[PDB]
Amino acid sequence: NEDICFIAGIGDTNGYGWGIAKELSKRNVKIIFGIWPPVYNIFMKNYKNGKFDNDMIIDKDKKMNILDMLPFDASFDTANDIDEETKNNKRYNMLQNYTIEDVANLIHQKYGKINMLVHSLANAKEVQKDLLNTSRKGYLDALSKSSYSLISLCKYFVNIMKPQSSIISLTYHASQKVVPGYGGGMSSAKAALESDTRVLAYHLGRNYNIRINTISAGPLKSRAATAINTFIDYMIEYSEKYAPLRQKLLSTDIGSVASFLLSRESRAITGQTIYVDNGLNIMFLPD
Amino acid sequence: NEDICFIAGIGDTNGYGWGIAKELSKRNVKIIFGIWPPVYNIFMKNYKNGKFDNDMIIDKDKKMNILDMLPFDASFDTANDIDEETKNNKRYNMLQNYTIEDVANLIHQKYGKINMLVHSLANAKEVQKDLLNTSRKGYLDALSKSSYSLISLCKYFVNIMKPQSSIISLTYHASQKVVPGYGGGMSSAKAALESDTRVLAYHLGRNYNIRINTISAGPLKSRAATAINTFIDYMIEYSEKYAPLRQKLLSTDIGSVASFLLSRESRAITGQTIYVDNGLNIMFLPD
Amino acid sequence: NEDICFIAGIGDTNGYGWGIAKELSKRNVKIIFGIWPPVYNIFMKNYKNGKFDNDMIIDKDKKMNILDMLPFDASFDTANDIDEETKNNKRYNMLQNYTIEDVANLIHQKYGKINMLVHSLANAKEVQKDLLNTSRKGYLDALSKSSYSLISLCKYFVNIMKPQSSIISLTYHASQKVVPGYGGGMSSAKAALESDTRVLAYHLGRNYNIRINTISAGPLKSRAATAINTFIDYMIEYSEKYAPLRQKLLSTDIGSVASFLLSRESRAITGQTIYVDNGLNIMFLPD
Amino acid sequence: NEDICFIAGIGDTNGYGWGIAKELSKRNVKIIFGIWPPVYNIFMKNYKNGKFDNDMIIDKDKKMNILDMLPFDASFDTANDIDEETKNNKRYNMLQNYTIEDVANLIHQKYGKINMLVHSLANAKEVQKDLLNTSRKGYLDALSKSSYSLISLCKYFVNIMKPQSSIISLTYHASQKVVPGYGGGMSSAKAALESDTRVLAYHLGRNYNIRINTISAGPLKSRAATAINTFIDYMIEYSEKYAPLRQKLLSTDIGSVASFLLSRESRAITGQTIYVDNGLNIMFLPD
Ligand SMILES: NC(=O)c1ccc[n+]([C@@H]2O[C@H](COP(=O)([O-])OP(=O)(O)OC[C@H]3O[C@@H](n4cnc5c(N)ncnc54)[C@H](O)[C@@H]3O)[C@@H](O)[C@H]2O)c1
Ligand SMILES: NC(=O)c1ccc[n+]([C@@H]2O[C@H](COP(=O)([O-])OP(=O)(O)OC[C@H]3O[C@@H](n4cnc5c(N)ncnc54)[C@H](O)[C@@H]3O)[C@@H](O)[C@H]2O)c1
Ligand SMILES: NC(=O)c1ccc[n+]([C@@H]2O[C@H](COP(=O)([O-])OP(=O)(O)OC[C@H]3O[C@@H](n4cnc5c(N)ncnc54)[C@H](O)[C@@H]3O)[C@@H](O)[C@H]2O)c1
Ligand SMILES: NC(=O)c1ccc[n+]([C@@H]2O[C@H](COP(=O)([O-])OP(=O)(O)OC[C@H]3O[C@@H](n4cnc5c(N)ncnc54)[C@H](O)[C@@H]3O)[C@@H](O)[C@H]2O)c1
Ligand SMILES: O=Cc1ccc(Oc2ccc(Cl)cc2Cl)c(O)c1
Ligand SMILES: O=Cc1ccc(Oc2ccc(Cl)cc2Cl)c(O)c1
Ligand SMILES: O=Cc1ccc(Oc2ccc(Cl)cc2Cl)c(O)c1
Ligand SMILES: O=Cc1ccc(Oc2ccc(Cl)cc2Cl)c(O)c1
């Protein structure tokens, strides 16, 4: 029977979420996009305007099958959690049912139980400051949006998931080793994410027979990556120069691994940080 | 010349902070206690009442030399950050200059530049819930109080520290491996703490020639440990049964290591998680 | 089209080698078995008699496509390494082209370049002794047969492998955490093997565009697992009781991850220790 | 009172062994040098002539207290292991009681039980070759001399050591991350050695109440470091440029950590790889 995957964190076609959606489509997985409200209408415009048609090609006979595309904000757990300021926002005022709980309800109401969950989102409002100059509000924002949001996602989605479902998120090696430009408590958020992945694997594994893993991806010139002050170009030039595999890293490279982790093929893997980065993580120094 | 250590996180004599204060005293380090406001007066009462006199004995000729004891709340960065509710609290209303910045100023005003800093505090208001049932507010509290507080401590204290100063904090292996009762995002807070320790080592090391490390201690029946629902007794019974070293773990065991890390003897060590837990971390399973 | 895999280390159908063969067979990969001479003829007689006929049942009717079965000894790099006594041993006198180089040469002659390599073998004379009690000779035996053998397979098989080829081995968590009973220097060999996997990922990735990883498998009741003093019953019981995923771990659970890592889907993963143990490695203590 | 340390691996004053001896000497520990026979006599002639007289200067006048200097070869476990050719080699014919057991026996006879043990030696015939190019013999050479030797020292010295004694060795980060140039299987040996340190911490902690750890030292221009193909100049330059702590790493920086780990102050630490490299290990890439 059909499998359904909710992917939280799609803003365009240039990030890992799209890559994952693409590769799942090779396997005939029905895709639901969770899109952050501020960029939801523009995404919808581009999509309707056919801007993504070329990017939706799987191959000769296949074309990405997107079930639905919904507004999703990981800043908010339930309806009660939205503040008046966001309520009164140009971009949000015209949308509804976009809190993490509302989306689970809405999906379940529309299409029943799902069996695949992808957390592909991060945010840190002080990413451009180093850790030592990051404010408490800044740091807790990184953690709220980039780490707590995985926990909330699970808390609310497990009700609408079949036994033997699988969940993945995306991390970065800044958590384990210093990467000077990865500021604002983003390194910290990733660190908590990778540990939470373990603690969750235990809970979800024991209570629901549901698996959860995280992919530590190498650099990709995505929207958010360009936001960091360029960082991402140095990162890519460095990976391509010194990684064991001197080949350009594509989002569908992470996509194919995500697909495997999300399938019954990896029935015995849970609680892991899997490195999909051309082996760059294994190097001590430039050679 | 004299060395001064600020220890943040002393509530009684039964935790790691006291252990560290004791061992630093063997080396004639002047100790300043940072004490959380809610328990400051009771600590002061006990101290004046002589309740701690036996616990202050170093040995035949030495007696812990406590320079000062100040109210300290890691919840608050500066004066501006205190809310009206805490302002209007029985325990705080009668105290002042207890925010992280105020304490650095106050210490520096009183005794000049210090050269040793100890973060020995944690808190998580939902520690009794597992990760999956922890609320966003709960989780961010763990992180604010247990992890951001190290960053803030450094941001503000480096101004009042000599070159070649050293800083330590305390972590727990729950960050790296699942420990089912360590709830409320405490595992997450520790994970972020250990990663932050690295990122900070880079910044402080390069800019100020200041070192920072963290000690992953094994279980000790402390005030906060008894708070966890008992957990701590199982933990201790287990460590004593299966650790490589079948010997009771004492706070001064962590104390002696802290003393070494805080001294010039470990001039070449920074950014590390050091395990002071009778080797328990090396075991896969009960033997 | 025309994927060929050499699986080094199969004596019967109760191992992880068998499980890897079955899952690869499912993707229509051509299987070549490398078989240690002590057990080769009993394996062939068993095979011809159709004792494995039941074990080759894949799903609804599909049967294993074993392309060849070759005598193989990972002890010997080249014909010139073989000592006179082994050459004339009862079980070896009747066999040829069983050294690492010779099986490389052989495979190439009969089938051309292959693109998949599985190191699925370990040995140690003194596995029953704990590390402290292991002789220099028995430790070097363990390293030689269990660790050097991977380096040697690589040096020789890289010649007969197409660019973008993939290589896996199997490891155990005793290299990272203490597991009493895993003696003879087998933990040392797994440690070395997990570290050689990184060093090799570098050389092979840069010079040949070939990937190599290692699977850290959970416990399985194979022939060799029993030769360890029982140990394995305890291991399996511990695992089924305490793992996040309380299911029986099957050889085909490993096989499908092996399959994935050998395929182009894992193009961006190299140098890695991938855990396939139902998440047991993430646990600190039992509950 | 009456601490005795056997330091295995000193040829001159340019190593980490020298640095360990100097720092131990500062705490009034009695030093016994174990000296590889190829360099023993040139070391003695040098010593008697007072070539090391300058190097024994500690602080304001204090000089090293070398209690003994013994020929020692970690290749040989017992007299019966020594091959006829080595026995009659020019440099060995004039020496006795140089195997591991014999130096144990010897030390015990002349001084009684000791309480500190330093493994400060490595070797590999084919260090100049990369892993892929290393022969079976040269790999086993590396493991034998660099890794087995620690297990063997332990098995024999535990007999002549008091409860609560301590044991250190030296390792390098090439076991965990790829370092081209660190060939011959030296990375494999360090991997094995860091894993054997855990296994040994278990046995020795439980059966003898003895601790063992390992220091992962940063680069130092010792005799052996130069024998590696230059490699070390590059290593030191990289390290001084990119480490969190941009200071020159001295042998005595290692020595004072060794001292700490051998003393009772580290009573609760066992099984650990302690990094002494100015924090370089925490770095992902240069800046
Ligand atoms: N791009 C890289 O180099 C790289 C390397 C390692 C890991 N990652 C991880 O991969 C994931 C995907 O990011 P990306 O690199 O593809 O960039 P991206 O911009 O394509 O993805 C990030 C998405 O998160 C969404 N988002 C931001 N705040 C949100 C909120 N409050 N609620 C819901 N959604 C929100 C944004 O709309 C954006 O589309 C990220 O979590 C990132 O940490 C990326
Ligand atoms: N006790 C253990 O078993 C154990 C094991 C590993 C690590 N640790 C760590 O050691 C450290 C010391 O704790 P402990 O175990 O000695 O218990 P403890 O209760 O003695 O120490 C915790 C202290 O933190 C203080 N504190 C709480 N909230 C604060 C705030 N907002 N601002 C300032 N101070 C605050 C409390 O007053 C308390 O005295 C903790 O960080 C803990 O995580 C403890
Ligand atoms: N069985 C487990 O529970 C388990 C758990 C983790 C890892 N592993 C790993 O899996 C591998 C073994 O698989 P298994 O557990 O099914 O045991 P197994 O006995 O089924 O497989 C090992 C095979 O290797 C062959 N072999 C031994 N020495 C050889 C040599 N010198 N040259 C060629 N072949 C040789 C043997 O004939 C044997 O059939 C080992 O690397 C082991 O470390 C096994
Ligand atoms: N030098 C560095 O930069 C560095 C960095 C990390 C680790 N280490 C470790 O330190 C140790 C060596 O110290 P070093 O770097 O000062 O080199 P070194 O040459 O000064 O010390 C090694 C000594 O071991 C002795 N030795 C060699 N084979 C022996 C045997 N079979 N029996 C007894 N003794 C033997 C040699 O005589 C030599 O003096 C090694 O374990 C090495 O891995 C060194
Ligand atoms: O090159 C490494 C890299 C680049 C981008 C990443 O994603 C983000 C980074 C920061 C922020 Cl604020 C948001 C996101 Cl989605 C990331 O995790 C790692
Ligand atoms: O036995 C392990 C253990 C016990 C206590 C600990 O400290 C705390 C734990 C939770 C909270 Cl809310 C506060 C503190 Cl100080 C800890 O870190 C680990
Ligand atoms: O339970 C875990 C386990 C069981 C078996 C294993 O394989 C071997 C273990 C020792 C020897 Cl000599 C040979 C082999 Cl194939 C192993 O690696 C781990
Ligand atoms: O720069 C890092 C470095 C330098 C020297 C080292 O020691 C050796 C290295 C190889 C051999 Cl054969 C012997 C020894 Cl003592 C080492 O371990 C690491």
Residues A142/B143, Cβ–Cβ less than 8 Å = no
Backbone angles phi, psi at C34, to 5 degrees: -95, 125
What gap in Å lies between CA B153 and CA B161, rounded to an integer?
A: 12
Burial of A28 (0-12, 13-18, 19+ CB in 10 A): exposed
Catalytic residue check, B172: yes
Tokens, residue D35: 């000296």
Task: Determine which residue's CA is closest to atom 5 belonging to ligand 8.
Answer: D225
Interface test with A, best of B195, B198, B204, B216 (most A CBs within 10 A): B195
Residue D31 CA to residue D65 CA, distance in Å, equals 6
Alpha carbon C172 to its chain centroid, in Å, reads: 12
CB B269 within 8 A of CB D215: no
CB-CB under 8 Å, B283 with C177? yes
The beta-carbon neighbor of C203 closest among D132, D151, D204 is D132
Contacts of D59 (CB under 8 A, 6+ apart): D26
Torsion D127-D130-D134-D140 (CA) sign: positive
Distance of CA B110 to the CA centre of its chain: 22
User: Are the CB atoms for D195 and C188 separated by under 8 Å?
Assistant: yes
User: Which two three-digit tokens encode residue B235?
Assistant: 């933990």
Q: Which experiment gave this structure?
A: X-ray
Number of domains in chain B: 1
Pairing of strands B161-171, B30-35: unpaired
Interface test mutation site (partner C, options D101, D148, D153, D169, max chain C beta carbons within 10 A)? D148
* Dihedral sign, Cα of residue B122, residue B123, residue B127, residue B132: negative
Cross-chain residue pair D199–C131, CB shorter than 8 Å: yes
What are the C-alpha distances in Å from B132 to residues A148, A149, A159, C244, D272? 10, 11, 13, 15, 32
By residue range, what is the domain housing residue D122? 1-287
Nearest of B146, B152, B143, B74 to residue A143 by alpha carbon: B143
| DSSP letter for each residue of B251-282 | HHHHHHHHHHHHSGGGTT--S-EEEESTTGGG
Q: CA-CA distance, C155 to B230, in Å (whole number)?
A: 56
Which residues of chain A have a CB within 8 Å of the CB of B147? 188
Q: What is the residue-wise DSSP string for chain D?
A: ---EEEEE--SSSSSHHHHHHHHHHHTTPEEEEEE-HHHHHHHHHHHHTTSSTTTTEETTTEE--EEEEEE--TT-SSGGGS-HHHHHSTTTTT--S-SHHHHHHHHHHHH--EEEEEE-----TTTTS-GGG--HHHHHHHHIIIIIHHHHHHHHHGGGEEEEEEEEEEE-GGGTSB-TT-TTTHHHHHHHHHHHHHHHHHHHHHHH--EEEEEEE-----HHHHH---HHHHHHHHHHHHSSS-SPPPHHHHHHHHHHHHSGGGTT--S-EEEESTTGGGBSS--
Q: Among A174, A179, A283, whose Cβ lies nearest the Cβ of D177? A: A283
Residue C246, SS3 per DSSP: coil
Residues C62, C128: Cα–Cα separation, whole Å? 40
Of C162, C128, C126, the C-alpha closest to C141 is C126
| CATH number (domain holding residue D2) | 3.40.50.720
In the 3-class helix/strand/coil scheme, how is chain A assigned residue by residue? CCCEEEEECCCCCCCHHHHHHHHHHHCCCEEEEEECHHHHHHHHHHHHCCCCCHHHEEECCEECCEEEEEECECCCCCHHHCCHHHHCCCCCCCCCCCEHHHHHHHHHHHHCCEEEEEECCCCCCCCCCCHHHCCHHHHHHHHHHHHHHHHHHHHHHHHHEEEEEEEEEEECHHHCCECCCCCCCHHHHHHHHHHHHHHHHHHHHHHHCCEEEEEEECCCCCHHHHHCCCHHHHHHHHHHHHCCCCCCCCHHHHHHHHHHHHCHHHCCCCCCEEEECCCHHHECCCC
**How many whole angstroms separate alpha carbon D7 and alpha carbon D26?**
15
Between helix D251-262 and helix D16-26 the angle, nearest 10°, is: 50
d(CA A177, CA A219): 15
The CB density around residue A133, as the number of other CB atoms within 10 Å, is 14
Tell whether ligand 3 has an atom less than 6 A from the beta carbon of residue C18.
no
The CA-based diameter of chain B, rounded to the nearest angstrom, is 55
- How many other C-beta atoms are found inside a 10 Å radius of the C-beta of residue D89? 14
- Here the tokens at position D150 are 């620690």
Cα dihedral sign, B172-B174-B177-B181: positive
* Run of H or E residues at B236: helix B231-242
All residues of chain C having their beta carbon less than 8 Å from the beta carbon of residue D141 are none
Q: Whose CA is nearest to atom 1 of ligand 2?
A: B220
**Contact yes or no for B282 and C180 at CB 8 A:** no
Q: Is B117 strand, coil or helix?
A: strand
User: CB neighbours of D244 closer than 8 A, spacing ≥ 6?
Assistant: A178, B201, B202, B204, B205, B206, B270, B271, D278, D279, D280, D282, D283
Burial class (CB in 10 A: 0-12, 13-18, 19+), B95: middle
Interhelix angle C186-208/C149-157, nearest 10 degrees: 20
How much distance in Å is there from the Cα of C227 to the middle of ligand 3? Answer: 11
Say if CB D74 and CB D121 are below 8 A apart: yes
The CA distance from B207 to B220, in Å, is 36
Q: Are strands D30-35 and D66-71 parallel, antiparallel or unpaired?
A: parallel
3 state SS of C31: strand
Give the pairing type, strands C57-58 and C62-63: antiparallel
CB-defined site of ligand 2, < 6 Å = B 9-11, 15-17, 36, 39, 72-75, 120-123, 145, 170, 172, 217, 219-220, 222-225
Cβ atoms within 10 A of the Cβ of C193, count?
A: 29
* CA atoms of A29 and A262, how far apart (whole Å): 10
CA distance D195 to C190: 9
How far apart are alpha carbons C87 and A171 in whole angstroms?
53
Quick check: helix, strand or coil at residue B80? helix
A277 contacts C272? CB cut-off 8 A: no
Parallel, antiparallel, or unpaired for β D114-119 and D4-8? parallel
How far, in whole angstroms, is CA B114 from its chain's centroid?
17
Which residues of D are the active-site residues?
172, 182
Searching chain B, which residue's CA lies closest to the CA of residue A138? B148
Size of interface A-B (CB pairs under 8 A): 112
Tokens of B220: 């000790």
Alpha carbon dihedral D35, D37, D41, D43, in 10-degree steps, equals: -30
What ligand 5 atom has the least distance to the C-alpha of A235?
A: 1
A123 lines ligand 5 (CB under 6 A): yes
**Contact assessment for residue A155 and residue B132, using Cβ atoms and an 8 Å cutoff:** yes
Give the one of B132, B143, B194 whose C-beta lies nearest to A143's C-beta.
B143
Resolution in angstroms comes to 2.3
Beta bridge partners, C117, equal C6, C167
Cα B212 from chain centre: 13
Tokens, residue C253 = 């659970």
